[PDB]
């Protein structure tokens, strides 16, 4: 009953239906492994189809604590409380959880995204206003018998599955390979090697994780530290040199379009991210095809052709393996065993020549520790 419980628009996140309060109020909620608050629209906003009405819920309790979150791309503010929360196409339970009722915001809600709040699935360390505010998943596990694990299968064109409490074997093929969760704050991981069409970027591996690397379903792009980003764009450019693209394309701002069905996938290279394995100096790789890192835009006005944005961008806050990386993998957030599994998803990307893959093991004898 949990399969196919996600929806989404390209570049706008994936969301799950939830209810809040009594009687239940239905909301679509963005599934966000890069944050740790359950935060929902709770006042009118031009971009909100609907919002949480606390006065209509007889089970609401105000915690009499406010919360204000300025972040890079926007800001939001509201009031903390608790109320009854359920996931209709998730586990068959209702729990009491913290809820941040969003009363003011700037560039937080997205016009036409079809979601009205965010379900932060990461750990208390990064909850706002501080780490004493217990995140949703922690309340779910505490109050029920649900195992301390969830998995995400995000699919491109959008839709997918969030399975809570276990692994659905129908959602992947081949082996599940695990990388340690380095620290329970973000879902922090370690990248030990990067190749672009099999060619090693040859950087000290600490560079790949300056200053952290995270798995974040609430960021669209693959985001890379400046030095890594510059190196990767240079290699992608060298491989795709039979065609030259506007400057703005590489800055992730500008569309490139081809006539229907003629996208030259074969001129774009595959990116290999090798992730730390569960045993010393062993790793596995996930391979990323241009079908993932050239994100298709779905706008009626541009629909005659196939148009894309370059979904790799420069970061000053570390590597972010965002939704375009997660797409086509089945990703297991095995909180109980402090690890994240990757497998090829049933909706994995492929063409006649190449397929997204998860492969291992690889051993590297002369390895420093790759973490910051
Ligand atoms: C608790 O405060 C926040 C602040 C920002 C976020 C976002 C967030 C906020 C609003 C919208 C999105 C979003 C937008 C487009 C596509 N996907 C997600 C993300 C930012 C992003 O990390 C940089 C992330 N993982 N979640 C979540 C909770």
Q: Does any domain span residue 8?
A: no
Q: Whose CA is nearest to atom 2 of ligand 1?
A: 69
Last residue of one domain, picked from the residues 146, 178, 195: 146
Do 103 and 172 lie in one domain? The reply is: no
Last residue of one domain, picked from the residues 116, 146, 176: 146
Do 18 and 153 lie in one domain? The reply is: no
The total domain count for the chain is: 2
Range of the domain at 80: 14-146
Q: State phi, psi for 341 to the nearest 5 degrees.
A: -100, 145
8 A C-beta contact, residue 14 and residue 154: yes
Do 63 and 195 lie in one domain? The reply is: no
Residue 77 alpha carbon to ligand 1 centre in Å = 14
Q: After which residues is the chain broken (C to N over 2.5 A)?
A: 157
Give the nearest ligand 1 atom to 128 CA: 1
Buried b (16+ CB within 10 A) or exposed e, 71-87: eeeeebbbbbbbbbbbb
Cβ(220) to ligand 1 under 6 A? yes
Which residue among the candidates 83, 106, 131, 216 is catalytic per the annotation? Answer: 216
Cβ(215) to ligand 1 under 6 A? no
Resolution in angstrom units: 1.5
306 catalytic, yes or no?
Answer: no
Residue 12 alpha carbon to ligand 1 centre in Å = 10
Q: Whose CA is nearest to atom 4 of ligand 1?
A: 71
Q: Whose CA is nearest to atom 24 of ligand 1?
A: 218
| Chain Cα centroid distance, residue 304 | 29
Cβ(118) to ligand 1 under 6 A? yes
How many Å apart are CA 342 and CA 176, to the nearest integer? Answer: 5
Cβ(216) to ligand 1 under 6 A? yes
Q: Does any domain span residue 41?
A: yes
Ramachandran category for residue 183: left, alpha or beta (phi over 0 → left; psi -120 to 50 → alpha): beta
Do 196 and 334 lie in one domain? The reply is: yes
How many Å apart are CA 277 and CA 29, to the nearest integer? Answer: 32
216 catalytic, yes or no?
Answer: yes
Which residue among the candidates 32, 83, 138, 334 is catalytic per the annotation? Answer: 32
How many Å apart are CA 361 and CA 370, to the nearest integer? Answer: 17
8 A C-beta contact, residue 292 and residue 324: yes
Buried b (16+ CB within 10 A) or exposed e, 108-119: bbeeebebbbbb
Do 217 and 93 lie in one domain? The reply is: no
What CATH number did the domain enclosing 218 receive? 2.40.70.10
CB half-sphere exposure, 134, CA atoms < 13 A: 13
How many Å apart are CA 62 and CA 327, to the nearest integer? Answer: 38
Q: Does any domain span residue 7?
A: no
Task: Return contacts of 182-185, CB within 8 angstroms, 24+ apart.
Answer: 182/371, 184/123, 184/125, 184/338, 185/122, 185/123, 185/125, 185/126
Q: Does any domain span residue 3?
A: no
Q: Does any domain span residue 192?
A: yes
Residue 302 alpha carbon to ligand 1 centre in Å = 27
Cβ(35) to ligand 1 under 6 A? yes
Do 177 and 35 lie in one domain? The reply is: no
Cβ(13) to ligand 1 under 6 A? yes
Cβ(137) to ligand 1 under 6 A? no
The pair of three-digit structure tokens given for residue 325, joined into one six-digit string? 């990386």
8 A C-beta contact, residue 47 and residue 135: no
Do 72 and 183 lie in one domain? The reply is: no
How many Å apart are CA 122 and CA 183, to the nearest integer? Answer: 11
Do 131 and 172 lie in one domain? The reply is: no
Q: Whose CA is nearest to atom 27 of ligand 1?
A: 35
How many Å apart are CA 196 and CA 38, to the nearest integer? Answer: 37
Top mutation candidate among 7, 29, 35 for ligand 1, by most atoms within 8 Å of CB: 35
Do 63 and 117 lie in one domain? The reply is: yes
Q: Does any domain span residue 34?
A: yes
Give the nearest ligand 1 atom to 127 CA: 1
How many Å apart are CA 341 and CA 277, to the nearest integer? Answer: 10
Cβ(39) to ligand 1 under 6 A? yes
Last residue of one domain, picked from the residues 146, 179, 214: 146
């Amino acid at each position: 009953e949990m399969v196919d419980n996600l929806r989404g628009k390209s570049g706008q996140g994936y969301y799950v239906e939830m209810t809040v309060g009594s009687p239940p109020q239905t909301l679509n909620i963005l599934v966000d492994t890069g944050s740790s608050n359950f935060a929902v629209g709770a006042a009118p906003h031009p971009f909100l189809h609907r919002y949480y009405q606390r006065q209509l819920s007889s089970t609401y309790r105000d915690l009499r604590k406010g919360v204000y979150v300025p972040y890079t791309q926007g800001k939001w503010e509201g009031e903390l409380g608790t109320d009854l929360v359920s996931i209709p196409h998730g586990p068959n339970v209702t729990v009491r959880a913290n809820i941040a009722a969003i009363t003011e915001s700037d560039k937080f809600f997205i016009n036409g995204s079809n979601w009205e709040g965010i379900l932060g699935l990461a750990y208390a360390e990064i909850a706002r206003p501080d780490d004493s505010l217990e995140p949703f998943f922690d309340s779910l596990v505490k109050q029920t018998h649900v195992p301390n694990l969830f998995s995400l299968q995000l699919c491109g064109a959008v839709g997918g599955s969030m399975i809570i409490g276990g692994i659905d074997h129908s959602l992947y093929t081949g082996s599940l390979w695990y990388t340690p969760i380095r620290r329970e704050w973000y879902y922090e991981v370690i990248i030990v090697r990067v190749e672009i069409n099999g060619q090693d970027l040859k950087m000290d591996c600490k560079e790949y994780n300056y200053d952290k690397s995270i798995v974040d379903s609430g960021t669209t792009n693959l985001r890379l530290p400046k030095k890594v980003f510059e190196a990767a764009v240079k290699s992608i450019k060298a491989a795709s040199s039979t065609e030259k693209f506007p400057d703005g394309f590489w800055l992730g701002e500008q569309l490139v379009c081809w006539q229907a069905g003629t996208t030259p996938w074969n001129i774009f290279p595959v990116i290999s991210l090798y992730l730390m394995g569960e045993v010393t100096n062993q790793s596995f790789r996930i391979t990323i095809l241009p079908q993932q890192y050239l994100r298709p835009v779905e706008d009626v006005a541009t629909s005659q052709d196939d148009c894309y944005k370059f979904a790799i961008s420069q970061s000053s806050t570390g590597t972010v393996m965002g939704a375009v990386i997660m797409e086509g993998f089945y990703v297991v957030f095995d909180r109980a065993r402090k690890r994240i599994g990757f497998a090829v998803s049933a909706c994995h990307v492929h063409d006649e020549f190449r397929t997204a893959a998860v492969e291992g093991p690889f051993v590297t004898l002369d390895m420093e520790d790759c973490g910051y």
